[PDB]
């Protein structure tokens, strides 16, 4: 099954020149295990 979402987000405006990237998960009164099984990343700044 597939889900797609698209938005113009001008990153220069909101984030610093240097960033760290990652994953976050939380539980509350109700809960679930949240796991990542593989991760690929690539960026290119001209």
Six token digits for residue 11 = 């990153």
Give min distance, CB of 25 to another protein, in A. Answer: 4
Residue 1 beta carbon to another protein: minimum distance, rounded to whole angstroms = 5
Alpha-carbon distance of 46 to 35, in angstroms, equals: 33
Q: Which of residues 1-46 bind another protein (CB under 8 A)?
A: 1-12, 14-46
Cα–Cα distance measured from residue 36 to residue 24, given in angstroms and rounded to the nearest whole number: 11
User: Residue 29 Cβ, how far from another protein at the closest point, in Å?
Assistant: 6
Contact residues: another protein, CB under 8 A: 1-12, 14-46
């Amino acid at each position: 099954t597939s889900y797609t979402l698209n938005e113009v987000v001008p990153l220069k405006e909101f984030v610093p020149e240097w960033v760290r990237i990652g994953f976050s998960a939380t539980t509350g009164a109700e809960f679930a295990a949240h796991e990542v099984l593989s991760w690929y990343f690539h960026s290119e700044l001209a």
